[PDB]
Amino acid sequence: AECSVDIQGNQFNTNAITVDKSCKQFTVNLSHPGNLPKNVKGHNWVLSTAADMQGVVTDGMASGLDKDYLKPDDSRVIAHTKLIGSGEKDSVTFDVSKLKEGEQYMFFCTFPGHSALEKGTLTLK
């Protein structure tokens, strides 16, 4: 099965990612659609459990641009890309051993305000 997915904003281009349970690693390739720099309007892709999302997003906003809008040493973050701006791309590869069938995961952007629209479910199946 395939073990990668391409994601970009148009809102993400998908609101549901499925990871095949035979994948040992999974890769997300994020690209930035727009013409603004990352300090003005950046994007990232961040994965956590559904329950942990709000905490990751809220603490991330508080931590600010210098920290890529993530709280340092946030153990709730399962995987993430860096924050990117216009013309940039970033990929993250993570171990599928971090995911479990039946559990609910969310992916989202933690740039301030983006997670209302830039979010989706991730499922291991």
1 binds Cu ion, rule: CB under 5 A: yes
43 binds Cu ion, rule: CB under 5 A: yes
Least separation in angstroms between CB 32 and Cu ion: 9
Indicate the residue among 76 and 96 with the shorter CB distance to Cu ion: 96
109 binds Cu ion, rule: CB under 5 A: yes
- Count of beta carbons in the 10 Å neighbourhood of residue 56: 25
* Interface with Cu ion: number of residues (CB under 5 A): 6
Residue 5 in contact with residue 81, Cβ under 8 Å?
no
3-state DSSP helix/strand/coil % of the chain, to nearest 5: 20, 35, 45
Least separation in angstroms between CB 43 and Cu ion: 3
80 binds Cu ion, rule: CB under 5 A: no
- Count of beta carbons in the 10 Å neighbourhood of residue 17: 19
Token pair of 112, please? Answer: 């301030």
Residues near Cu ion (CB under 5 A): 1, 43, 109, 111, 114, 118
